[model samples]
Target: STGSATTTPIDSLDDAYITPVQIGTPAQTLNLDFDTGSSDLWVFSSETTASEVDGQTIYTPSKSTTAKLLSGATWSISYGDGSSSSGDVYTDTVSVGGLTVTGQAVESAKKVSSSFTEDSTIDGLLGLAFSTLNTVSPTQQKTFFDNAKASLDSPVFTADLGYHAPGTYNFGFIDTTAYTGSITYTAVSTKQGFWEWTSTGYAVGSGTFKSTSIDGIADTGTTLLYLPATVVSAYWAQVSGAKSSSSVGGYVFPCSATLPSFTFGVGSARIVIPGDYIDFGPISTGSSSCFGGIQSSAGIGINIFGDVALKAAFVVFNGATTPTLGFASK
Candidate 1:
């Protein structure tokens, strides 16, 4: 089977993309963030304390006749940014595009951190990472993609992530029209339950490409591009007014700074991130200061090719054979 889903950008360019997912027997639709960074399908639900939920939508499991609670099972997840959620588990029908998986594990939140509660637009998170990373207690759960993969015509999915624009997430099939030129393939190491890959090197603007290999992960849930501290400093050094601000917690510069393009090597192909994309939105409303989308992944051990880097190309999450990543310009 094959399916297609539409993904739309949320407000700022640094925000994550949102897609509609149907859950339960009668089909309760929720706008979810299809995240490749984490592997738990969680949603705000009736189990969540009223005081803990903000303006976000809630999933009522009782309304679905097919929803069944998994006895003594629970789930808790913490994100790289410190956002977290914990809840009980249930088995229900989960559908994306037109593909449906019966008895899919759905985590209904009982408690959520402030970061998730404040994000009213997103009703839940649909994890696309490997099933090995699932957090369900007693028994680990499987991701929606993993449960539906067996029946798929091709075990593949393509992410056409766009910059502040509409994009498409196609499952079991690849839309060649979404990208241009030839697709460059790179081997991925999934030992860490992530789309981990090594970059031959990277450079800032017109600088020489460094030959050092950098180990990083392709994370769709993350907003900014996080790199080694030394590399982050080097990029900001080229900007006159750029500096690491404790107040802003990252490199910030004048909004009009002449930013340089950033390039990273995947295999022999070089994916270029335009200078403009590096400049995230302004630090504050009506403020001249702006934060850099590319920052230091100091505390976080591995570098992350977040939305800032992913949107620069069309990425293919190849599950075939060795689980490779195919990239091409949009």
Candidate 2:
């Protein structure tokens, strides 16, 4: 017998690019990005002199007596954003919430590109997105989940977020604190390595369409959802005062008024995003213009719904049993 039959994918997508982690001891905490897009646990190290580490906290497993290095293994990773890092390999008794696993493969990138080297806030990234798209070679691919799953008390791994606060990225055995009953599960499509799904169509203000089919993969690594410019224009048209601004990679928006809520239904689940996300971090960039979430990436071919959209609910990916994803309340 399965869990609840009404289980929905709490998050827009069950498997994000990576399950982010907070590194360091009680004295300090650093927000690290997690990616299913890549594989490996890399933190800013003291040896990272090629890049600046003044504002960021680098992990020094050397301080932890429980840490161990792979001796000869080395790793490097590059993201779609053009940022990259490479370093030696090591093992440490890493802890995520109540789940602690020893012999975790950790990347120690000494050389980093501008995006990673200059960041004052983010320390490093933990790539648990998928086994195939992993940056490290298959023989050398190191995943915290792959190593720790066998020892987990339960066969499930769920990431729970409390409202809106940092350090809510928890993994390991399913926390029943927020769940009412057993969880309903789905089987993952036997495809490539990325956690991808086909978008049947999109809706705004409860409007629906059947003939229209928008197919793309959802990603947690990104902060905004990239869609066709026509879709952006149409969606924004419904929101008064919502206008575009300049961005490094794509077009953003600025709006003082509350935007309408939009929902994207895939299969039987409907994921909704409030209007604020449309103008998330609405910041003025001079000339009465500002930057927001919905960006224009007209020709990208792929539509990505980043964390901003994902944070709306709880998400779980069951790669073990059925290779399917499940959702529940946050």
Candidate 3:
């Protein structure tokens, strides 16, 4: 079976993307963040403390006949910092778009993070990363893609994220009409259980392509593109009045400055991100010191091709016998 679903940006297109998911028999719809960087289908629920619950929708297991608690099963996920969320596990009828999966393990967040509780837009997260990264302990569970891929016409999914518009995520089959030219494929190393791939090199605007191998993950959850400090410094050097300020956090530049478009190599094919994409937005509302979309991954300890880069092209996550990643310009 093949199905497709629209992924809407919860806030600004670059902040995050959410897909509406129906859970339970009557199908309670909840807007979930479709994250490719992590593996865990967690949601806000009635079990969450009233203090934690704000304006988000909560899943009521007692209301669903199909919902069954996975006894002794618990899940916890921590961010790079202290903020995190954890909860009990339950199996229920979960549906996304037209795709349905019975007995899907759903993590119900009883203990919510302060940061998450503060933001009311996203209800939960639907992880698309390899199930090997699932946080459920005692008995780890498969992701929605992992459980449904076998029945799919093809064991693959594609993410077509837009700049400031809505995009679609297609499962089972690639929508050929969605992209231009032929797709350039690259072998992926799921060693870390991420959509990890290597880029041949990168070019600063119209500058020459520097032939070097840079390994990174295509993370849909992350908002910024992060690379080595040298690569980051090289990109910002092209702009005037661009400086790495400690007060503002990362690189910041005058809103009037011209940002050079960034181009990265995927085998022989190149994906170019418009200069405007590099200028994420103003640091403060109406502030002229705009924060950059691309930053150094030194603190992260690894390079990441986040939404800032993913939104530039159509990306495919191939879950074939041997996983691979495919990229094509739209």
Candidate 4:
């Protein structure tokens, strides 16, 4: 079976992408973040304390005739953003686009004060990472993609993430018109339970391409592009007033500063991020300094090719027995 869905950014900064998912028999729709970094399908549901949640929609499993509680099942996950959630588990019919997966394990969140209160637009997360990373316990469940892989026309999915606009997600088959040029393939190591691979080299603006291996993960769930301090420093040096400000909480530059575009290699193909994406936004209202979309990940310490980079190309998450990543121009 094949399915396609649409995901839109939450704000101007492109902080996160949200996709509508249908749960239960009558189909209660919830806006969820499809996280490639996290591996659990968790959502806000009726099990949560009624008074604690505001604005966010909840999935009432009891309303679905097929919903079944997984006795003794429990899950808890902490995000890189410092928000976390924990909950019990249930199995029900879950649909994405038009593809249906029966008896999909759904984690009904009972605790998510930080995530829900801070980012009320997000009801929960539908993890796309390897099933081995699932946080559920007492019988870990596979992800939506994993459970549906068997029936998929092809064991693949594509993420056509956008800039300031909405993006598309397609399962089973590649949309030939979604991208330009031939796709380049690179081996992906799932040992880390991530779509982790090595990028061949990089160039800042029209600068010379540096031939080197940059190990990082392709994370659709993340907001910014993070690299080693050295790589990030080189890119920012070209900007006249760029500085790593502890006060600003990250590298910030004059809002009017002429920003440089960034390029990275996948196999032999090069994908360039436009200059506008580098300038994240004003640090605060009426502030001259703006935070950068590309920052040093040395503190958090892992190179991540987040949405800032992913949005530049058509990315294929090939879920073969031995997985690989595909990159093509758009």
- The numbered model that scores best in lDDT is 4
> Against the unseen true structure, what C-alpha lDDT does each candidate score?
0.89, 0.57, 0.91, 0.92
Off by over 4 Å in 1: none
Which residue pairs in candidate 1 collide? Answer: none
Residue pairs with clashing backbones, model 4: none
Worst 10 residues of 1 by lDDT: 9-18
> Candidate 4 on 1-330: residue-level lDDT in tens?
999999999998889899999999899999999998989999988888776688888999889998999999999999877788899999999999999999999999888865565678999999999999998887989999999999999999999998999999999999999999999989999988999999999999999999899999999999999998988999999999899999877889999898999999998899999999777888889999899999998888679999999999999999999999999989
Q: Each model's TM-score, in the order given?
A: 0.97, 0.79, 0.98, 0.98
Candidate 2 — what's its lDDT? 0.57
* Candidate ranking (lDDT, best to worst): 4, 3, 1, 2
lDDT of 1 by residue, 1-330 (tens): 888889998786648889999999789999999998889999999999888899988899999999999999999999988899999999999888898899999999999999888889899999988888999998999998888888888999888887778888888998888888889998899899998988888889999998878899999999899999988988999998999998889899999888999999988888999998887768989999998999999989899999899989999998886799988987
Give the candidates in order of TM-score, highest first: 4, 3, 1, 2
Deviation from native of the Cα of residue 34 in model 3, angstroms: 0.9
Each prediction's RMSD over C-alphas, in Å, is 1.2, 5.8, 1.1, 1.0
The runs of at least 3 residues in candidate 4 whose Cα sits more than 4 Å from the true structure, single-residue gaps closed, are none
Residue range 1-330, candidate 3, lDDT tens digits: 887889887776358888889999888899998889889999999899889998999999999989999999999998553668999999999988798889999999999889899879889999999999999999999999999998899999999998888999888999999999999999999999999999999999999999999999998888889999999999999999999998988999899988999999999999999998787778999998899998999988789999889999999999999999999999
Candidate 1 vs 2: which has more TM-score:
1
